[PDB]
Amino acid sequence: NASIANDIISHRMPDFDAYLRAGESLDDIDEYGFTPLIECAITRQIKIAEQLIARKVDINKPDVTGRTPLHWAVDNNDLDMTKLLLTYGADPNAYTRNGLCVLVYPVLRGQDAIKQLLYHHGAKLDFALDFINAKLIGHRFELQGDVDIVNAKGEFIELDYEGFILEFTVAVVKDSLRRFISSYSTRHLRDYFPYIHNIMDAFTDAAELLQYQHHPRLGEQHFKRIAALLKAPMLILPAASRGHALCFVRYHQWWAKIDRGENSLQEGSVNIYRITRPEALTINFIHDFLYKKQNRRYYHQMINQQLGLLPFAQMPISSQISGNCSWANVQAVVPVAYSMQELFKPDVALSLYDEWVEWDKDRALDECIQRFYLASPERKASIAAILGGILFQACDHANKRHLERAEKILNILILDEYYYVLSSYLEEYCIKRLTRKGNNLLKILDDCGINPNIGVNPVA
């Protein structure tokens, strides 16, 4: 074709004057959904970006998802492009449509240089930390609905507990594993740490392979990278099908499909096959798998025939029929990849999975509790809302661990300045009508030595 986007992708300096005479604006959204500056950021082309900035393009204009050019430069860990953008007015606290600010991914990936560069130009870390913690809590505790967090301007923005973000999920799962094997309370699991390490490695590669999905036109270097990763011992392939993320794991001659949703009613959650035609696992296979649009028939039948997937084993992973199973599908990668490395004993893998999940629940809760006492009034209100959501939705009065979490939470929700949270709940689920969860909340309050003085009593 003939396009400024195709010029940028092909590393050719565009003839900006010819495109302007043709009636185009250098801020226009191109055929790939991006602006010329966002194309420069994606392709790490700093000279073309300098040219565009010289022609006074909107340096903060995002794509439909809300990713500003600074978002794209930072997600690439490109220090020069990030510095160029920040020099000419890129908002360091811009957030995407889901509320994901510029700092989130560098925080999750431990990229200290770009984090300090963003700090120097005004980025606020609390926004990223609160977003990460709220999303992790909504996923781990299976919370429903929304909650309001505080942006870098002290204003409340909505956050969807149920919204699934794939790259965010991969990053947060890798970081959670890193924190898990580094906790004192998990030293008795030291012998299991090497295998986990490998899993983390795979997750890293997965992140890379996912980022290339945003590129408008993959080239020689992307295919060289895919060829390099096809030689890695372990491979994690998340696939999008029917609005859900299902997961595949390759480890040497073994292949594994993880789908805890509707399909698990027919197949079970986790199936492990032997790859009898490894010669079909090529660059073109990975491209069809990750970078072309495929239907359910491709992921549930075509790949079995192409790779010659011989059924070998299965894992009794619990189904997730209600809601969105993408998060659970990504979580289940850890025990499945562990078991595949063991090659067969799902016992240790499932026990490790349960221990990791419960530890991460308690870690996120402790993060919230610790940040409450150091927080501003608005962030305190947000954290109190999150804790009340945890208490009301995820704590059963017959579970002693849930009761310990409820004690932790009620230490904060009983303060006079925040009791209103509990008040609201008891107003909307105990006085107006006695729901099941309102009854459970009354029971929990009584088992912690708390009389709400509301006129309603539990019904055992």
Residue numbers in the entry: 0 to 342, 348 to 464
Paper text:
The crystal structure of AnkH shows that it contains four N-terminal ankyrin repeats, followed by a cysteine protease-like domain and an α-helical C-terminal domain. AnkH is an α/β-fold protein and contains a total of 21 α-helices and seven β-strands. The N-terminal domain contains ankyrin repeats with four helix-turn-helix repeats (α1 to α8, residues 1 to 122). The ARD is followed by a 4-turn-long helix α9 and an extended β-hairpin (β1 to β2, residues 123 to 162) leading to the middle domain. The N-terminal and C-terminal domains pack end to end into a crescent shape. The middle domain forms an independent insertion attached to the side of the ARD that typically functions as the protein binding surface. The structure-based sequence identity between the aligned regions of CPLD and XopD is only ∼12%; nevertheless, three β-strands and two α-helices are structurally similar between AnkH and XopD, with His243, Asp258, and Cys324 of AnkH superposed on the catalytic triad of XopD. The orientation of these three side chains in AnkH deviates from the active configuration, and a small rearrangement of the triad side chains has to occur to attain the active state.
Among the 8 core effectors, AnkH is the only one that is conserved among all bacterial pathogens harboring the Dot/Icm T4SS, including Coxiella burnetii and Rickettsiella grylli. While many L. pneumophila effectors are dispensable for intracellular growth of the pathogen in macrophages, we have previously shown that the AnkH ARD-containing effector is one of very few effectors required for intracellular replication in macrophages and amoebae and for intrapulmonary proliferation in the A/J mouse model. We determined that the host nuclear protein La-related protein 7 (LARP7), which is a component of the 7SK small nuclear ribonucleoprotein (snRNP) complex, interacts with AnkH in the host cell nucleus. We conclude that the AnkH-LARP7 interaction impedes interaction of LARP7 with 7SK snRNP, which would block transcriptional elongation by Pol II, leading to host global transcriptional reprogramming and permissiveness to L. pneumophila.
